[PDB]
Every structure is written in C-alpha cells, then in structure tokens.
Write an enzyme that holds these catalytic residues in place. Sequence first.
Site, short mmCIF file in Angstrom:
data_model
loop_
_atom_site.label_atom_id
_atom_site.label_comp_id
_atom_site.label_asym_id
_atom_site.label_seq_id
_atom_site.Cartn_x
_atom_site.Cartn_y
_atom_site.Cartn_z
N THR A 1 27.26 23.68 1.19
CA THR A 1 26.16 24.56 1.57
C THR A 1 26.60 25.56 2.64
OG1 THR A 1 25.27 23.14 3.34
CG2 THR A 1 24.46 22.74 1.10
N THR A 2 25.82 26.62 2.82
CA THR A 2 26.17 27.68 3.76
C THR A 2 25.87 27.26 5.20
OG1 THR A 2 25.53 29.30 2.04
CG2 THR A 2 25.97 30.16 4.25
#
Lengths: 243, 250, 167, 231, 240, 235, 195, 241, 244
Positions: A30-31
């Site tokens: 995920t970012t």
Amino acid sequence: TGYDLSNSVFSPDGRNFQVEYAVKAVENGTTSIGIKCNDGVVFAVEKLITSKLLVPQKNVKIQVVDRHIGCVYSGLIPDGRHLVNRGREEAASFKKLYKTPIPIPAFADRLGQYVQAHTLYNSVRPFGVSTIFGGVDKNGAHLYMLEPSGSYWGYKGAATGKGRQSAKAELEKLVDHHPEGLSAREAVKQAAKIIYLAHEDNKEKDFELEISWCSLSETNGLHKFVKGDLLQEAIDFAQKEIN
Amino acid sequence: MTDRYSFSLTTFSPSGKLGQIDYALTAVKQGVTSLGIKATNGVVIATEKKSSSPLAMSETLSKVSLLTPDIGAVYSGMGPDYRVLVDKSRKVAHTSYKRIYGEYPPTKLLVSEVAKIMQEATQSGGVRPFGVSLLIAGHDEFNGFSLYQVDPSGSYFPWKATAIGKGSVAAKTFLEKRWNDELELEDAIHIALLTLKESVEGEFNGDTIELAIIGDENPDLLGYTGIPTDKGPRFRKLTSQEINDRLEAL
Amino acid sequence: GSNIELHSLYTSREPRVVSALQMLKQHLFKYQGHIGAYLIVAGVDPTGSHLFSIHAHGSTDVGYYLSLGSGSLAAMAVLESHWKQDLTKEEAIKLASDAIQAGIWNDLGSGSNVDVCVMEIGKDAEYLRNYLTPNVREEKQKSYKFPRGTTAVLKESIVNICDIQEE
Amino acid sequence: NNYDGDTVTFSPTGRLFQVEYALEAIKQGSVTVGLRSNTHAVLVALKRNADELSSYQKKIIKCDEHMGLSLAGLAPDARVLSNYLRQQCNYSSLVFNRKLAVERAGHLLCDKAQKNTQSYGGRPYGVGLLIIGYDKSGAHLLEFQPSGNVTELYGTAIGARSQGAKTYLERTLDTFIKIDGNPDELIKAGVEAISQSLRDESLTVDNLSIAIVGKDTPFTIYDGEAVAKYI
Amino acid sequence: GYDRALSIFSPDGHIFQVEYALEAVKRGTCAVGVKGKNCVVLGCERRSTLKLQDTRITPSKVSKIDSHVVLSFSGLNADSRILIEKARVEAQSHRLTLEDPVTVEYLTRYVAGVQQRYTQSGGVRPFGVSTLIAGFDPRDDEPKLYQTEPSGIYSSWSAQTIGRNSKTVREFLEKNYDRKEPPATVEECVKLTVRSLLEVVQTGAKNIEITVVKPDSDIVALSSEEINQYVTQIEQEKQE
Amino acid sequence: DRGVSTFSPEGRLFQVEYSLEAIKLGSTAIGIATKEGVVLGVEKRATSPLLESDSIEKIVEIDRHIGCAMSGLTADARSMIEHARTAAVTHNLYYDEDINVESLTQSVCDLALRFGELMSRPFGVALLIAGHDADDGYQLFHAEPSGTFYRYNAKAIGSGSEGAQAELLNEWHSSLTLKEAELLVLKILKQVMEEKLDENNAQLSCITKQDGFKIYDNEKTAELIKELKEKEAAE
Amino acid sequence: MDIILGIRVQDSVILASSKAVTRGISVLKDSDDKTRQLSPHTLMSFAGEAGDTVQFAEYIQANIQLYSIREDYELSPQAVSSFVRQELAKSIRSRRPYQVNVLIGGYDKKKNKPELYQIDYLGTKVELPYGAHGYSGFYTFSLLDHHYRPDMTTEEGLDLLKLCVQELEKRMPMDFKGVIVKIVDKDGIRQVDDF
Amino acid sequence: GYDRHITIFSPEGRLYQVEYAFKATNQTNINSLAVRGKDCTVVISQKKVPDKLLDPTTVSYIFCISRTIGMVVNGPIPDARNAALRAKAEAAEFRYKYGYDMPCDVLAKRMANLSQIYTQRAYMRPLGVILTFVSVDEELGPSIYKTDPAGYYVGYKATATGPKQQEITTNLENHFKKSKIDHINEESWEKVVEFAITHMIDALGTEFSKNDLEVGVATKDKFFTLSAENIEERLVAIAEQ
Amino acid sequence: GSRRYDSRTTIFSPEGRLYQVEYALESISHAGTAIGIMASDGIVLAAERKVTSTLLEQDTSTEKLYKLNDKIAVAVAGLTADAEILINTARIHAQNYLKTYNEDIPVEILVRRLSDIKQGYTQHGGLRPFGVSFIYAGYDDRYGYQLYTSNPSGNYTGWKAISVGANTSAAQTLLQMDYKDDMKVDDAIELALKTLSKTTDSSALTYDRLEFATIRKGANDGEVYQKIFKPQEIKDILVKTGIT
Ligand SMILES: [Cl-]
Ligand SMILES: [Mg+2]
C-alpha cells in the site's frame, strides 16, 4: 544464469537480483508518504479495508521509535515491524550510553547498516519493505527513506508503495510552489490529499486514512498521531480536493 | 548469519585431481615472473614491479618482503593473497617460535609454518586455496643459506635456483645453463638480472625491478650498538641506484 | 617488543615510544598490578625523544628526569640536586650514572655495576654495558684449590650423550 | 518454481512461496469461527476426526484466564505458538502484575512468526490462529497468519470453506456487535455462522467445540454434552 | 559445525544412506555365527587376494569386547574400529557403575543404539558395518548370539551369517541347523561352522578363521593346522 | 538439494510425508480399547527361521499403567521409549502420582518435529500408546512423526492397516469384553499377515487397572489362538 | 591413619593393608580390603580421604583393564605406575584434588623382577625395596633398614612383615584391626588368609 | 557453474564474483579525482541529484573517517557506508591501542586486507566499492591510497575513479609528463582545488555549477569538505582567467 | 543458502563406496612409488622422488621419508602438505604415550591412532579426506620389526613387503616373486632397489631421484638405529647392487 537464486551474489551486471526482487514486494504494498515541513515532519499511510469486519482505527500501521521518531513502511508488514524493533534497540542503547536522544541522521544509519547487512549473506533474506521515517532533533527536522538495499537519503518529500508515482508528482508540486516552506498544519492537510489522490491506484477496495506528525511547535518535538477533529478536518480537505 | 560453510570447497574429482589447487596454480601461471638464485655466500630474490598505472607510486607496493631479519620472500600470482600471507608469516615466526626459543626460526621451519597455513586453506571449511606461489630465501646458523618454493597445495621444495610465474619455463632453462656450485653473490645478482630481462617487455631499470638479497650481516642497519653477538640483519633490499649500477656492467 | 616489531612491519614505519607505552600500560592495567613490572621507558622516534615511567597498576608519568626501584629515593635526591634544563649528552650521562651510584652505595637492594643506554636523535642507540665497575672483588688471601683425590667416590661411569650408533 | 526451495528466497515478482505454501496448510484445515460483541468474545470450532473409532482433534487452546485461541492447520505449530503466548501472558503477570493486552499479544506472535520467514534453515509456521480475549479496553478478536500478518476484527473465519461463514458475519455485523450482556445469543450467532461453511456433515455433540471470554467470564471451553444446548 | 542432514527420507519412504551402508556390508568379507548347546562359534572369511601379509600383526576379524563377549563384523574395516572402541569403553563403564559385567544383550543394545544415532544425526553418515556379537552372560551357561546392522535394529539368532555371499551360507544353515537338537559339543559346532564357510570361501587354507567362545570367559582362537584338520575330515566324508 | 524442513506446494512437510511411507512398509500393530482394558497386538515378522523370534521386542512397557506398540523403522523407537519412560518416572518424582496417558503421549509427540539443519530427520516409526488413569480411564493413542496424536477406540498401523481398520470399523462396540478384544486382535492379525499366525510370529499384550501392563506368554496366546479357530469353525 | 605397607623381595612383592574403617568415634568395619587388582600381575593398595580412595582406585582399575582388552597385552608395573602418577599430578592442580596415597606392587613378566612403587597424592613417585604411607613409615622404615636383604625369600619377607605389624600394634595409638596381606609374583596375585 | 556464484577459483584461475563486484563500482555513474599539492591533498567528485524530492545536503559519497583522513567512494551507497563505518571504527581503535593517529596508508592496507578476506572466505561477499583514502600524513606528507574489491591497494601521485576514469587518468598523466614532478606545485589548497576542477572539466568535456561538484580537502591535522558556496567561489576564479 | 554449494564429502555411492576415498586413492596412484621390505634383522624403506630438476637442492630435501620417533619412520605417497599435517600429529601422539607410560609407543598403537584420524574425515565433518598413503616401518619389544600401511579410508594392514603410490600392481608382483622369509637386510636393500628400477616411469634410476632408509638392530648391542641415507650414500649403494 542462476545468479538470482541466492542472496549476496553479484550478477555479471554487478547487481544483486534478490534485493531487486525484494523491491517488487515493496511496490506491491500500500501507499505511504512523508512530508518535511518548517519545524518538523508528517507521515501518512493508506490502509486497505479488505472487509467490513475490520475494526476501524485499530490496526495501526505507523510506529513510534523512542519518543521523537516516527516510522512508516510499505511492503511486507512483518519485515517492517522487525526493522522497527531493531531501531528501538538501537535508539535505546544510544540513549543509554550517550544520554541524549538519538539524532535522526544517526538513527538513519543504524537502520541502513542493519538492512545492508541482510544483503551480505545467502543465509538471510533481504528486507521486503521501504521505510519512510524521521523526526525532530537538536539540529531540526529530518525526513528519510530507506530501501531494501540499505540505501537511504534525506528527503523534502518521500513516497513508496503501489501509488508512489502519483504521490511523487504531488510532492514535487509542493516543493516548487513552497520554496520558503510549508507549515505543520498545512502538511497534515496536504498529506491527506496526497494519499486520497494516490488511492486511484488501489481504487477497487475503499481505504482508511492514518496520519502522524512530529513538530517543534505543534507537538513539542514528540511523535503523535493525528486524531479526532484534526484528522476529520484533513479528511474533509482531502475529499473536497478530489471532487 | 554465522559462517554456514563448514564443508570443504576443495574436493577430489573422479580423476583424482584437486580442482581448486590446479586452478590456483593456473592463477600463479598468469602472474608476473619472479625468481631466486642461491650462491655460496648468499641468496638473491627478484621480480618485476608491474605498475598498474604510471600515476601509481610503485615504491609503496612492496613485492619483496622481510619476514625475519635473515629471511625474505617474493611471490607470483595474486598480490592481496601474498600480502596477508606475509602478515601471518611474520606473526607465526614470533608466536610459534621466537616467543618460545628466544631466537628467530630457521628458514625451513618458517617455510613449514607458511606451508601449513596454505594447506589448511586447501582442506578447511568455506575457503579457497591461496592463489600464490612463494619463493622464500633465508639464512640460519646451522643450515646456512637456503631457498624454498611454496605452492598453493602447501607443498614446498628446496632449490639451488628457480623461477615461477609468467615465463618460468624459459627462465628455469636459462638458470640451468648459468648456475654452478662456485657462484659468488655478485655473480648470482648478475645472473638474476640477465634472467629477469628476458621476461620483461617495457622499461628495465631500478625503478621497475625489485630485488633483495640474503647475504652478510649489516651492522649499519641494526639500529643500535653495544651487543657483540647482535651483528645485524642479513636481509637487504637493493636500492634503485644499486640496481642501475649493476645494469651498466650487464 | 615482539608486538612492536610486528606493528612496525605492518605500518612500514619506525616504532614510537607512545605505542610501547600504551601497549604496556593497557596490558599491566588488565592484570590489576599482579604483574609486578615497574618500568622506565625511553627512546627516540620520528616524533622526537621521549621519557616515561610505568607503574605496575597501569599508570604512566612523563618527565625530564625519573627514577624507580628501591634506590629511587637515593637517585632522585641526586637528580633533584643536580638536574638542569638544556643538559648536554655528556652532562646527562654523568648525572644518570651519579644517580645510580647513589643507589648502589646507599641502597642495599642495589649494587655492583652501572649499565647505560644513550638514545640520541638521528643516531644509533649506544648500549654501554658495565659503563662503570666500582665494585670489583679484591684478591682472596688464599687459594682453595683441593688436592686431586680429596673427595671420596663410590662409583664412576661414562654417560652416553650421543645418539644411537650405526653398525 | 525455482524460488520455493527455502524461505530465504524471493521470487522475481517479490513473492515468498514457502510462506504461501504454509498459508495453504491452513486452507486444508478444518473450519473455525471467531466473533465478538462489546461485552463478550466467542470462538466456535468444527473439530475433525480421523475415522469413526478416532477422537475429534481439539481446536481450542487456553492461554490465560482472559485469553485463548482456536487453531487451523498444523496442530503441533499451534502448540508451540500457544505455549509462547502462555509464557508471555505469564511474564506480564509475574513481572508487572499486569494482564497482557490482546493487541500486544498479537504483536508478539507477529514478530515470532516473522523471524522464521527471513532466516535460512528454519521454516514458516504452518498454522493460522484466531485469538480472543477481554482486557482493559474490552473484548477483542485477532486473526493470525504465519506470514506474520495479525489483524484485529469484529468477526472472522479461517480454514476450509471459511468464506461462507465470513460472508454471513459481514451481513450480520450490525446485529451481533450489539449482543451485549447475553452470552448464549452471541454463541448462537457463532454457531449459525459456522453452519454456513458446512457441507454433507452437520454439527453433532462430539463434533462441535465452543469457547467464550467476557466481562465477568473467564476463558472457558465447552465440549461434549455442554454444547448440545446449541445444536 | 557441519550440520548437514545426510541421512534423509525419500518419496518412497526409504533412507538411501542407510540402505547404501548395507551395500557396503554386502561387499565385506563373509562372517558367520553358530551357537551350540554349551558354546558359540564365530567363523570369518579372509580373502586370499592379499598374500605377502603378516598374519601376526594384521588386525584380526574377531575382537574381544570383554573377557566374556566377542564381536565380529562385515563391512568397512575402519568403521568397525570405532564401534569396537565404544563398545569396549561401555563394557568397562558398566563394570564400574553396576559392579557386574555386561550381558550380551546389553552390549548389543548399546552398539545398535550407536549405529541408530548415526542415521539421524546431522553431519554424519551411517556406519557401513553389520556386527555379530556373541558370548555368555555372567554366571550363566546359556549361549548368546546377536546381530546388528547400520539402521540400528538388532535381534538374537540361533545361527546367522553376514557379508558377501551370506545368502548362500544362510541357505546352508537353514537346512542343516536343527533347533530341537543344536550342536551338542564344541567339535560338532565348529564342524558345522567350517562346513558353512566352505560353501563360499574357495580354499580351506588360510581363508577361514575360527574363534570358539565357551562359558566363564573361556575364549580361544583356533590355529591354521587345527582348522585344516576340520577341512580335511569334511571333504573326505563328502567323497561318497 | 533442498531443505529438510521444506513445505510442499500443497502445504505439507516433505520429510514428514515421506516418513509416513516408511511406516506403511512396517509390520502390523493393532490396538483395541475397552471398558475392561486395552489390548495391544503385533506381527513379529521374522526375516528368517533361524532368527529367535522371542528376541523381537515390538511391544514395550513405558510404566506400570502405560504400554506401547510400534510399527515402521523400529530402531528409531528406542529413543522415543527412553524419553517416555523418563517422562513417566520424572513426573512421578515431581508429583508423587501416575502421569496421564495423554500427557505422556504429548511429551513423546513434542520430540517429533524437533528436526532440522536437534536430530537430522523425523522418526520413521508410528506408536500405539495404550494405558489407564483415574481421570479418563482406559485410553489408546496413535502417535505419528508429524507431532500429531489422535485418541482411538481401536486402531491398526503398519502394512495391513487400511484393511484392518475397515474390519475394526465393523467389529468394535462400546460393550466389548477383554476376552472378546483379545480374540478380535488375533482374528484381524491373522487376516492381514502373510505367514500363518501362531504364538511364535505374533504377540499379545494388555493393560488393566488391577494388574497393570502385561506382555502375554506364548503358552497363553497359543490357547487364545486355539480358542479362536474353534469359534470360527462353530458357524 | 590407614596403615599400608609394601616389601619387595627376591621373587615377589608383598603388600599389607589395615582392615579397619573408622568414621569418627566408631570402627564401622574390621575386614576392609584396601586394594584393587589393576592387572593379573599388578596390585595397588591405597589410603587417604574417605570416598576419594575407592573412587580413584576403581577409576585406575577401569582404565588399565580397558588398555588390556584393547591391546590384548598387560602393561608393565613401571608403565602402570607412570600412568597413575600422571593422574595424581594432574589431580593436584584441579578444582578438588584426589586426596589419595598409593602403593603399586607388580611382577614384571618381561624382566622377571618384582617391583614396588610408592606414590603420594601430589604425584610423587619413587621405586623402593620397601615402602609405606602415612605414619606407618615412621616406625617401619627404620625397622626394615635393619632387617631387609634383596635376596630374601617370600617366607622371610612375611616374617619380616609380621615384625613390622607387631611393632605397629605395640606403639601406634589406633587399633587398625590387623592387616590383609597379599603376594604378587610370577604366578599372579594371592591372599594370605592366615596372618 | 557454481564457481561464478561464490569466491572460488574458476578453471582459468579467476574469481568471477570479484570481477562482478568491480562492475557494481560504476553503478552510480559518478567520476572522482584525487591530486596532491605541496601542503595538501584534494579530492573532487561529481554530485548528481536526479530527484527534486531529495534533500541535496544528504547526498554525498565523501566521508570524514578521522580528523586527518578523508575517504571518497565509487560504488553503491549501502556498501559505501558499510566501508565508511568500519574505517571510522578501525581508525579510532588504532589511536586507542597504539597512541597515535592512524596513517592513511595503514588504514588503506587494513581495509584492503578485510576485502581480501571476502575474496577467500565463501560466506562473505565482496563490497562493490573502490575506496580512495586521502590525507596529509605527518611522516609521508600528502597521500593518496586506493583500495578495490580484489583486496589490491597502492599509493598514488594522483588518481581517478569511475566510468570515465581513463579519460581523466590520461589527462593527469600528460600534465605530470610536462611538469616532471610528483605533485601540483602550488602553495594554497584553494588553487589546487581549482587545478583539480579545471582538469576534470577538460577531461570530461562538461561545465560544472556549484551543485554539480563535491569537494574534499586534506591539510595538516585536519580533513574537511567544501560547501556549495565555497565551491562557487572556486568556479568563479576559474572562469575569470 | 549454503547447502547449494556443498559437495557432501562423506557419503556412500549406490554401490556402497565412499566417493572421496576412492578419488583420493586415484590421486595417490600417480604419486612416486614407495616400497617397504621387512627382514629378520631389519627393515628397508625405499622411495622415488617425482620428476626432479638439476637445480633442486637434494641434500636438504625431504618429500618421502619422515621420522616419527627414534624407533618408527614413515614413507609417504600422495600430497606432501597433507602428510606433514598427519606426521606432526603422529609425532605428538608418540610423545604423549611416552610421557604417560614412560615407554616408547608400540608401532601398531601409533598406526591405529593415525588411521582413526583418517577414518573420521570419511564419516563426519564434511571435509575432504587426506590424500595420503603411509608405509610405517618400526620396531618395538613386543612384535619386533613391523611394516604397516594406511590409506585415506583409515584402514590399515600389516605386511612382510609392500608398495604404495604408482605402479603398485607391477611392484607387488615382483616383490611376491623374489621375497623369502629368511631374508636379510642387505638382500632386502637389493630387492627394494631392483623393484623400483623396473617399475619406474623414468628412463634410468639414479641417486638424485631416490630417498632411502633402513631400520637396523645393526647398532652396538641390543638397540635399534634409524639411518636416513645421504645422496652420496644412495649413490654408493646403487653401485654396490649393480644398477648404475
Ligand atoms: Cl589486517
Ligand atoms: Mg612419596
């Protein structure tokens, strides 16, 4: 061929393919981002809501080291936790011997050397995380980003994970439009926006926003999580910008 | 972590060959030529200072090394391997001998200790053999002057004269014709310079050649006076000027 | 001395006195005074000339003049009376040997002869064994050489020191 | 393929196959369900037998008076991990006179499992765990995977055919969370949830295994005729 | 340390290293054990490819573990010395702590336990040796004969053979040995042991070794001439 | 080559699965639990007639209240038995009581997965652990090299296991007497054995609360074999 | 004081050792054999601290018996005595030393000579014509200095030994409850049952 | 073909892992240069900050090992920092044990010996870096000593490292052929830095701004790095003549 | 991990042979021939140096014959460096025995100890075996004159006459033909040299290509002398026997 089957083996290029494969695990995650502001730093992360059964605000991803350093990472979550556990041991022994809390550049190298050590032998696997971290020390604010190879630099803004390109573009605009600098409260708002904008790369599942910050004025140089009204204020600002 | 290579990396092949030792000898073959000649009143060891760059100061790199005051060494093959062997050789001369008997070891026994170290790298776990062949010249009271060769296997042989490395086959033939049992030290140095010129391509002078002798005691190089029994080191490295003087009478 | 030689070979430099000083004091300190070595260390090196003392517990001292041993007080009395700045080589040898003589005559733990070593800059060190010999035994009044056969013997035998023989 | 010989090797796409194969062992295991309200937390486990002469393998293990888990996969690995939790819960009590937080218990399991995925010679754990507990911040339910990933949830299920029970809980989320001060109704919801994962076989008296913990309820396991009430 | 797992299972449920150790035993010279009513005899083959040997000093095939127990073997000779040494040490250790010499069963169980340990220990290979352990328990007149193998399994035998062509001599013993009435005397027992080896040995000269063990620590090795008399008598009866 | 503690793509440990194949090659062992006791029986399977069959020890005492039968690489069982005996006696020393059969079985099974690169490989032997305690009464456990143990009313392991297990499926009921169980083990052993069953190539044993663990004499088993033949000929 | 004596005559070695075992104020036993046969032609008597004596003797015995089996050969008394001395010399600088004194009487079958070795707990070995440990020597050494010859018979050696024991019974304060006498010669070891 | 994976000999007598570590050296695509003055030793290196998000002050391949010794690295930063930390530790230990500051050449030898061990021992990989150590030694004067992954090391009159090392090397070679001396005959270090930058410009054929370069200077009893403004002053002086 | 590169030096082949031992023996078969002959009044040790040079210093050289103690010596065949490791261990073992029992070590005991060390390298440790075969020549008061051989497998056997190294098959046939039990040292010396002279791969057998030694009771009265022959002494015995 066969150079990519074992860690710490140089290919004919002079590359360590195992480390490059660890980067793929990071790119799959995920970012997460980091923003350096006037008197501190702000961290933010994307938390994918896999199911309604996930308890909101409970599965905390951002981790504190000592009382003045924040750590966030993308990739294999357990690998990130292991790295933070080490970071905490490193920070504890520094403070034990030298009294003062560990400086951020000093702390950055402690992680760097530890991650780099996991590229020296075939009996260990490289770390499957890129870690964004930093905080406030005697010399001011510092933001760092550390890769599986052990490579790290200082940053004005940093981003990693699946939505890193989108984020990086947004961070570059802030650096250009604010040469004099960005405030801590502004950085929290901007951090929220960037995660929301970076969520287009993970647009299938909805997500939960998590932000933290260290600031000399706003938090007395201590790491704190953004909660309640200030968090909602940042979410509203972020939602307004995407529409 | 931990060194998990506790097994041998050098093993016998079906033909009975020890591959890593053979390959180490091949690395020695590629190396720059070095030689040794034994005279009645001394021993000479010599080699070419193959400079990797003209900007590099070749004086700082020493191919010929003092092991004890009466023992010297030169090599052919991998320089770094040689450098660490010299460090270990110097130390073992003290720990396994001088600190016990109060005197420096005789040539053959120091050679034996170096040979042992090289053998262990041929059998121990998680290591390759040393990629060098050493020529060790030395003197001691009861054995006199002596010259030994030491190979990657750990095997060592005494020589009247010999050569190792690039042009060793031709150099050994040249030495067989010139060597006799009545040679004086100066004659051996002269033959050493003649033999070494054949294997060298470019410049041939005191700055590109490294040469040392095991000869008479040098009280001027001792550093102190007052003890009659201490007469100074027999090992002496020839200067750039001293080599060039003998190249005029060549 | 062994480790200094190996260090000198490793570094391609002449050994320094501070290196010997440091190695000695760290060794002695580790053994908490149980190695009863009290030393005066001196020498010349690329840095210059140096003079130190070492106590068995690991303490070092710097000075222009020093004395150790049971006769150190007799010697120091001489040094404190006659030492001055800007001494010559000949004046220093005299002062040193005079200080040792004070110990020889006045201290029962000290006696016999005087050894000296001079370490001058830009020169070889000269070791002067038995520089002074002020305590030669006088001739004995009588010779105690015995008549051969004076001692009573029971057995005689040849001792075989040689190796096992051929044939 | 070429990158699944050991745990120390990433694949070209950044995958750890030995960890993924360990994850596969959980899917082969018998179904188990976990869910909670604000007052209580419940574990429901379908036990598996070898044949008709054999006993039904136990699925639920007690860790402390206020904490315990259910397993799915390699049972011996669950015994190792539950033993570790028992010790950690115990260390917290003896040293700090403090009941171990369920969240912190999850963090300790995560870190223990992680070390086995980064080192040569060893292997990942081949079991998935559902930890329930009641601490100073109320009821809790955790899901442990041997990759190291631990997740706090309102409800969940792991094992074979666990997707059916997980969907049911996702629909019932708003209902069962509100079941406060009523243990029997919370178990009923758990028994009804695990029923969505059944095929051919049904819940019998020696097949079903239930456990509960809550506000004034120590971690207790129910087996045999004690669960006939809920069939 | 070297920790590598050399002895491991294969898809068909076999430990090949243990099975290949049995092939080393198959290669070894033949050894035979026969127990009578009041004695046990250990026969051993000596391959006659090696002449110019010094039979005084050459390691004998039968080894005394204690004054009342003996051990013969088939397989790797170097490996057998390690088992024999360990067995001898354990025999003295047993006398020291229990104040009584080992039983033949106990000594066998120890040697078998050592062999087993080498099949599931890291960095080691199994022993390429099978043993025949024979003797008499302290203050007991019942003969004992046990066999061990690389895997670590052991068992008692009325009569048994191991080594090369052991299949043939086992065939001989199975038809010639009667349990209801075993070799009543030393002569009958030795004769049967020599007969069994003569099926395989080749020449009956210096190729057969015989060792007789009787109760109360009475162990003796037969000489060449004594054995040659058995060889002569057997073939003269056979010419009929 | 490949790791000893490696997982297969199906999620099983290669070495554990391979050790189970070795156990299938082993001689048959059967256990039957009743309210009057637990019976353990084994196939001896001598490789040659010269081998003295009474020396074949495939049924073993762990304590007075716990017995054990084995099948597979029987040499591997010796260290497991030694551990079991030590665990049983040690517990009595620490707690002045008999140890629970389940707790004993659990202690043995803890050894199972202690292998890696500890011992170099899993055990190549399965165990039927039978015993009695005051809490759970007469019990029968099946201890594998996977570290897993199941309790059983009846169980067969070894080469003729699946054929014997199917037979135990039909024959076992909760009201079996000890005598009925003895004959039932003999019946099923005789069915799956290659050679003809007699007192020399098969062995019986039992564990009761009163008398404890007992290995049956060859004379006692011979009578039970004769009693079996007659009752099968009776219909 | 645990009286142990030894005398080497023409063709044999004779060892005499007291029978008493006194622990504190009570004589617990009056028939104790303070000796172990190391090999068929080698006997070792011992005396020292309780427990250590037997533990040491049996340890030595086991080692020599192990050697005998391994080599199918009996070690010479000289070889056995040197082995024993080294064990005691090793022992004296240990954490807890063996507090044992020994006499080793043996007949060397190669040289056809009897041999007597006296070794104390420090590892001090001496070959002697006659020896003793503890306070026994204070009486017996001077007595044997007067009555001994190298060419004495075994019977004369026993009469000479009776003279030692009589003196000890007269002048020593402890009742050591007589001695067990053993002879070591070419035929092996045997016990004199009437003394 | 496992002789190419670990540090054992190939049939040709070669160590392929060592050779591939040399190739990793140029992964950063940076060129460095070192020259000696009368009283000083100067080292310059290209500085490249491709990302705008980077803090350019933290981007550096020059390290202050001790007060007297400086080190520039050619190779990836993780291995560079690994070497730097070790050299700092070794230099400090040396001073504690032997009572005087570790010389530049001795440190170079020590690091070279450590590198040699990685070429002989299988479990340790070589570091993909070339270490250039610089100082003004109290005995030998201005000093340049360079170490590589093979464990080789030697002193230098001047040197260059990187992708375009040969172009820089020949440029320096040609200058010393004219002057016929082993150093830059210049009093101030400022002018020696100007020489270094000028000859890198000539060799590479590229112009430099203040942020394109990174400079380290060694004088008697201290080594220091120049700031962007110090370099700018240096670039101005070059342009004005 | 590291497993990938492990040769596994201590394993059985499907046929039940030890790979590395067999290959080590193949190595030894190319080494210079060494012969041992035992007589009633002594033992002979003869050995051939491998393709020497005129510039080799022979009088100070030793590659074949080594002294273990005053009573025992060995002839080497294989890697010299490997042999010296074992020789120094054997020398220490002999001194340990002497210190313990105050008697010189019996020959067999020394041989067994070295052979047990070799065995260890074939069963455990994962290291390559020593590529060495020894001929032990020694004397003690139990068995008198004794000849033994040990090889990389750690197996040892006793001999009246034996050869190791190159051309042992041919050498053993020649020894088996001319050897007799009542033979003497002077005759054994002649046999050893004649056997080497026929089995040698060289054109002619000369003094500079040989190492020679005898263990004789030919020492003044009841004692044993070791004689390592000098180059000139080897030259004389070659003329005496009529080879040169
Ligand atoms: Cl070093
Ligand atoms: Mg004494």
